Swiss-Prot record, chain C:
The keyword Ribonucleoprotein applies. Component of the mitochondrial large ribosomal subunit (mt-LSU). Mature mammalian 55S mitochondrial ribosomes consist of a small (28S) and a large (39S) subunit. The 28S small subunit contains a 12S ribosomal RNA (12S mt-rRNA) and 30 different proteins. The 39S large subunit contains a 16S rRNA (16S mt-rRNA), a copy of mitochondrial valine transfer RNA (mt-tRNA(Val)), which plays an integral structural role, and 52 different proteins. GO terms for biological process: mitochondrial translation; translation. It comes from the Eukaryota. It comes from Homo sapiens. This is Large ribosomal subunit protein mL43. Belongs to the mitochondrion-specific ribosomal protein mL43 family.
Swiss-Prot record, chain E:
It is found in: Mitochondrion. Component of the mitochondrial large ribosomal subunit (mt-LSU). Mature mammalian 55S mitochondrial ribosomes consist of a small (28S) and a large (39S) subunit. The 28S small subunit contains a 12S ribosomal RNA (12S mt-rRNA) and 30 different proteins. The 39S large subunit contains a 16S rRNA (16S mt-rRNA), a copy of mitochondrial valine transfer RNA (mt-tRNA(Val)), which plays an integral structural role, and 52 different proteins. The gene is MRPL30. This is Large ribosomal subunit protein uL30m. GO terms for cellular component: mitochondrial inner membrane; mitochondrial large ribosomal subunit; mitochondrion. GO terms for molecular function: structural constituent of ribosome. Belongs to the universal ribosomal protein uL30 family. One of its GO terms (biological process) is mitochondrial translation. Keywords: Mitochondrion, Ribonucleoprotein, Ribosomal protein, Transit peptide.
UniProtKB/Swiss-Prot annotation, chain F:
The keyword 4Fe-4S does not apply. Component of the mitochondrial large ribosomal subunit (mt-LSU). Mature mammalian 55S mitochondrial ribosomes consist of a small (28S) and a large (39S) subunit. The 28S small subunit contains a 12S ribosomal RNA (12S mt-rRNA) and 30 different proteins. The 39S large subunit contains a 16S rRNA (16S mt-rRNA), a copy of mitochondrial valine transfer RNA (mt-tRNA(Val)), which plays an integral structural role, and 52 different proteins. The chain holds residues 41 to 206 of 206 of the full protein. This is Large ribosomal subunit protein uL22m. Belongs to the universal ribosomal protein uL22 family. It is found in: Mitochondrion. Disulfide bonds: none annotated.
Curated annotation (Swiss-Prot), chain G:
Belongs to the bacterial ribosomal protein bL20 family. The lineage of its organism: Eukaryota, Metazoa, Chordata, Craniata, Vertebrata. Pfam families: Ribosomal_L20. This is Large ribosomal subunit protein bL20m. Keywords: Mitochondrion, Ribonucleoprotein, Ribosomal protein, Transit peptide. Component of the mitochondrial large ribosomal subunit (mt-LSU). Mature mammalian 55S mitochondrial ribosomes consist of a small (28S) and a large (39S) subunit. The 28S small subunit contains a 12S ribosomal RNA (12S mt-rRNA) and 30 different proteins. The 39S large subunit contains a 16S rRNA (16S mt-rRNA), a copy of mitochondrial valine transfer RNA (mt-tRNA(Val)), which plays an integral structural role, and 52 different proteins. Interacts with OXA1L. It comes from Homo sapiens (Human). GO terms for molecular function: RNA binding; rRNA binding; structural constituent of ribosome.
Length: 82, 59, 148, 79, 120, 159, 140, 275
């Protein structure tokens, strides 16, 4: 009845050593969300910067613009990955 | 897994509102938990510039 | 420095090891002066090593131009259309052979900075972390301070 | 004013323990001083005769015809 | 004045409590020391810097084999605060010319003359 | 002395195709050694930089500064050679695309060195209606920019 | 002037290709750009040590965060995975924490299991059977 | 006037480089530049890919029909490409459907047709043949080689490798250059669909499973400008997929896409291609 972590929320972790004791086999299949645990699907520059700040819960300073020296230092074709 | 690129990216960096009842609690020991969840330091995706902080509602 | 230089991600050209390996070096263009003391080690490279080199990789087409140059060059062209022009000016034959094998072994991608030392295209197998991994659910999907 | 923490005391103490065991293993030599005497005089003398010998064998290198003539290749041309 | 420090001989006389503490025998002691520099010779006097150069200990954390003879022990008593001493114990024999390459000095202090990389 | 801006009216383009939009005209005109300073012409040159030439003329007739009359001569002259020399059918259908002012070859007067300051005035007129001024970006544009920056971000310094 | 210097545009331009992105006259004037370009190269080499350092504290922040999700603390996880002869490093554990959180959950279960065997072994002291995951694989 | 020559030569060539960057010339094809031997470089294209061709047949694989027509427009002052490209694209369509029917047996054949029409699309095949030196060997009329022409020459090269050395070696060729283009791409980046929910509903009718209930599993930030939803999709109160989104409809459609990847074997955890 021992569980080293409460195997309830992410995966059901079942540790094992092998008979030689050299490799640790972990067995951990996924824990599905139960159907009981779900809800059914329900069916001017000043005031604009205050309105965006209060909308997105950030300060005001990232809504003021920046000069051309900062707009043109920017890399417009940045390298992509994955 | 098996999400598309955009909803995986949305799902990872999405920010979570936490509730935190401060009755009979010390203010600094609430402040430590609140501070960790405000910086995003409770996420393994954390980075300073990546802006992954959350919301803490202390009642 | 890294902020002055451009950078890129580590890549291949057309998934160059997956199916088969393709030599990314198409053309070499040696240009060697006949009379000229700077292309001496180029001369002894064409005489000794360029036929052995041209047989060790037949997907490479090699042009020895042998004009009156005052600096000899090797011009590697790559399958993705990159051009690396390097000099073989006042080099020994062995230094030219390590340079030509250096150009053979590499690909046409830039020698600008590489950002990460790796490139998975499928980094996650068990599903990437989102903040609702590692959280338990509640009965009927309730949230804190939800009465019904 | 600077004060002593518990890190500094525990560190200082584990250096004292390494020191005490150094005291232990220096307290039982395998030989007495009469037994050790001249027990490695030969190897020390041959070692210094090697140092002496490499000191007294210093001289300019050999100069060759082939190097001096091999400078003439700087005007090797094709035909 | 800061001078060179002699250390009296009662400091270097073992007690049977210490034979119970460490693993030593006063009769039939060990032949070879393993000495390891673990504290810099900088901010130390120049004589201790020299003794570290003689003993062959200019790298930190690199073991060196010495004889357990009173001359080498005298130099070790000069710099005993910078070094660490263990007995070189040898579970099997000293290596013959067959086992000369395939040795490994382990961290216990023992020198094993057959060093496979396979588990037991 | 360099004189590259006068030459710019000499570019001859190869003739177009019938499945191709009509290229607008470009009329590079300038005046050299205006006795005025280059930084006082910057306000007059800056004033008219996207206006139609009738709005530019109209704004420069009622300005008090010395350079306004000089720029109005440059723009009436470039409206003339716009129509005569460069096949612009309507006098009205021009706008100022470029109006700058460089420094000219100044003189030095020993009093105690004091410069007699000269300037030029460079105007490119472009055939067509003046381009619509840039609208101030709304909260929809700011919100989409912010969210697109949030969509852009990656787990950094990992696989 | 018998031989005055012809090839001086190129020495200047060897410095100024590194300064093309600075601010102020540092991108233009050679006297200013030399002090800033030298000073940028000194920072550029002292920052190799800080790149290594800051990646490692970044990994400890990510392993700390992800192991606090499973109740463990960082010293408990790293200590009791050393004690299991799982010689993974911080880079790999942080990357498993992000991309493979079931393997990270099972590693947190293996480290807390080993932590409890360390507790129960160092509680009931004396000769007893060792824990199952407490056993070590001897290499000879 | 500083006497000397070397700084004026170096400065002369840097002025030449700023002339090339300020006003670069239009790109000329490679056969109209120095160091070109066309026959030697067709043989190099053969040995580069590690196979053998009958060299005349590969030569006709690079000769378009536009080139002959503008060439005979230039005569007045060669076998075409189309037979080999017909055979090559017929073969590569049926062998790509062989591979993708064998390694994805649960796909609908509409999806196999959209995968195969991705791996023989103009974007993929034109991206492949600009890095295999096909474009440099194409005898085309105009430069750069327009993408329909270069698609035709690429499948002509497949047809020439077919008549050279049989169906198995071309199967390995198509495997190693066209199939490796779907590494790192998700299924619905290749087979685009609108209404994935109706498609998932129809597929679940074909397995004789009931229609799935979309059912909100987890959420956050519901009354903000940055919500997050995980909609689940249950079948007889067991979920088949669950996906996130910024709104509820977005997450529901995306959970339908997760279920469609799961029905078809095209998950992110699928066994990779065995090369």
């Amino acid at each position: 009845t021992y569980s080293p972590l409460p195997d309830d929320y992410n995966c059901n972790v079942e540790l094992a050593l092998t008979s030689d004791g050299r490799t640790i086999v972990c067995y951990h299949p996924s824990v599905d969300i139960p159907y009981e645990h779900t809800k059914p699907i329900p069916r001017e520059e000043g005031p604009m910067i205050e309105q965006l700040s209060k909308m997105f819960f950030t300060t005001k300073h990232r809504w003021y613009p920046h000069g051309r020296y900062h707009r043109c230092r920017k890399n417009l074709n940045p390298p992509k990955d994955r | 897994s098996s999400f598309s690129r955009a909803p995986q990216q949305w799902a990872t960096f999405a920010r979570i509102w936490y509730l935190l009842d401060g009755k009979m609690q010390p203010p600094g020991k609430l402040a430590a938990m609140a501070s960790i969840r405000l910086q995003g330091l409770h996420k393994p995706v954390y980075h300073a510039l990546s802006d992954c902080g959350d919301h803490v509602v202390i009642m | 420095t890294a902020r002055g230089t451009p950078s890129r991600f580590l890549a291949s050209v057309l998934h160059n090891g997956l199916g088969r390996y393709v030599q990314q070096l198409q053309r070499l263009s040696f240009s060697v002066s006949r009379d000229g003391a700077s292309s001496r080690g180029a001369r002894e490279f064409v005489e000794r090593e360029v036929i052995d080199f041209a047989r060790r990789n037949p997907g490479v087409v090699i042009y020895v131009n042998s004009r009156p140059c005052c600096v000899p060059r090797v011009v590697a062209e790559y399958l993705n259309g990159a051009v690396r022009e390097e000099s073989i000016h006042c080099k020994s034959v062995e230094e030219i052979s390590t340079l030509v094998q250096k150009l053979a072994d590499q690909s046409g991608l830039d020698v600008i900075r590489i950002r990460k030392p790796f490139h998975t295209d499928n980094p996650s197998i068990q599903g990437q972390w989102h903040p609702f991994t590692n959280k338990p659910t509640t009965f009927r999907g309730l949230r804190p301070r939800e009465v019904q | 004013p600077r004060f002593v923490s518990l890190r500094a005391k525990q560190n200082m103490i584990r250096r004292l323990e390494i020191e005490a065991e150094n005291h232990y293993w220096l307290s039982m030599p395998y030989m007495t001083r009469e037994q050790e005497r001249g027990h490695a005089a030969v190897r020390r003398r041959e070692a210094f005769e090697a140092i002496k010998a490499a000191a007294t064998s210093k001289f300019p290198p050999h100069r060759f015809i082939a190097d001096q003539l091999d400078h003439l290749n700087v005007t090797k041309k094709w035909s | 004045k800061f001078t060179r420090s002699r250390i009296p001989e009662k400091v270097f006389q073992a007690s049977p409590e210490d034979h119970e503490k460490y693993g030593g025998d006063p009769q039939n002691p060990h032949k070879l020391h393993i000495v390891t520099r673990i504290k810099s010779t900088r901010r130390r006097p120049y004589w201790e810097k020299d003794i570290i150069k003689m003993l062959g200990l200019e790298k930190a954390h690199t073991p060196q084999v010495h004889k357990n003879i009173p001359s080498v022990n005298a130099k070790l008593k000069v710099v005993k605060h910078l070094i660490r001493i263990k007995p070189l114990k040898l579970p099997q024999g000293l290596p013959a010319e067959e086992n000369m390459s395939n040795t490994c000095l382990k961290s216990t202090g023992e020198l094993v003359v057959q060093w496979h990389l396979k588990p037991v | 002395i360099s004189r590259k801006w006068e030459k710019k009216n000499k570019i001859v383009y190869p003739p177009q195709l019938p499945g191709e939009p009509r290229r607008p005209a470009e009329i590079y005109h300038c005046r050299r050694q205006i006795k005025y300073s280059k930084d006082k012409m910057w306000y007059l040159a800056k004033l008219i930089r996207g206006m139609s030439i009738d709005q530019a003329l109209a704004q420069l007739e009622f300005n008090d500064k010395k350079g306004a009359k000089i720029i109005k001569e440059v723009l009436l002259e470039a409206q003339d050679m716009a129509v005569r020399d460069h096949n612009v059918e309507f006098r009205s259908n021009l706008y100022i695309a470029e109006s700058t002012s460089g420094r000219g070859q100044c003189l030095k007067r020993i009093r105690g060195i004091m410069e007699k300051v000269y300037c030029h005035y460079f105007v490119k007129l472009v055939e067509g209606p003046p381009p619509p001024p840039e609208p101030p970006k709304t909260a929809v544009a700011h919100a989409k920019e912010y969210i697109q920056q949030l969509r852009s971000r990656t787990i950094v310094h990992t696989l | 002037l018998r031989n005055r210097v012809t090839d001086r545009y190129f020495r200047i331009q060897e410095v100024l290709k590194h300064a093309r992105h600075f601010r102020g006259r540092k991108n233009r004037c050679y006297r200013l750009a030399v002090r800033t370009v030298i000073r940028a190269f000194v920072k550029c080499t002292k920052a190799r040590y800080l790149k290594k350092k800051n990646m490692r504290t970044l990994w400890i922040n990510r392993i700390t965060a992800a192991s606090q999700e499973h109740g463990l603390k960082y010293p408990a996880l790293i200590g009791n995975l050393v004690k299991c002869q799982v010689e993974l490093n911080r880079k790999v554990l942080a990357d498993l924490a992000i991309y493979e959180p079931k393997t990270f959950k099972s590693l947190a279960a293996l480290a807390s299991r080993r932590r409890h065997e360390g507790f129960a072994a160092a509680l009931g002291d004396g000769k007893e059977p060792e824990g199952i995951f407490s056993r070590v694989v001897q290499y000879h | 006037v500083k006497k000397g020559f070397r700084a004026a030569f170096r400065f002369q060539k840097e002025l030449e480089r700023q002339r090339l960057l300020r006003c670069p010339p239009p790109p000329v094809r490679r056969s109209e530049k120095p160091n070109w031997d066309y026959h030697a470089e067709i043989q190099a294209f053969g040995h580069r890919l590690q196979e053998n061709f009958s060299l005349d047949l590969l030569k006709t694989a690079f000769v378009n029909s536009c080139y002959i027509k503008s060439e005979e427009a230039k005569r007045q002052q060669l076998k075409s490409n189309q037979e080999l490209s017909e055979q090559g694209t017929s073969f590569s369509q049926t062998c790509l459907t062989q591979f993708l029917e064998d390694e994805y047996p649960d796909m609908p054949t509409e999806g196999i047709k959209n995968l195969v029409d991705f791996l023989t699309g103009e974007e993929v095949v034109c991206h492949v043949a600009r890095n295999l030196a096909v474009e440099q060997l194409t005898l085309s009329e105009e430069f750069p080689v327009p993408p329909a022409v270069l698609q035709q020459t690429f499948f002509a090269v497949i047809g020439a490798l077919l008549q050279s050395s049989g169906p198995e070696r071309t199967a390995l060729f198509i495997r190693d250059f066209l199939i490796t283009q779907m590494t790192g791409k998700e299924l619905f980046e290749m087979w685009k669909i609108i209404n994935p929910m109706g498609l998932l509903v129809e597929e679940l009718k074909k397995r004789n499973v009931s229609a799935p209930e979309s059912r909100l599993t987890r959420q956050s930030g519901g009354t903000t400008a940055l919500p997050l939803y995980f909609v689940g999709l249950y079948c007889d109160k067991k979920l088949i997929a669950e996906g996130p989104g910024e709104t509820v409809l977005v997450a529901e459609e995306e959970a339908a896409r997760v279920a469609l990847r799961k029905l078809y074997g095209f998950t992110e955890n699928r066994r990779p291609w065995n090369y």
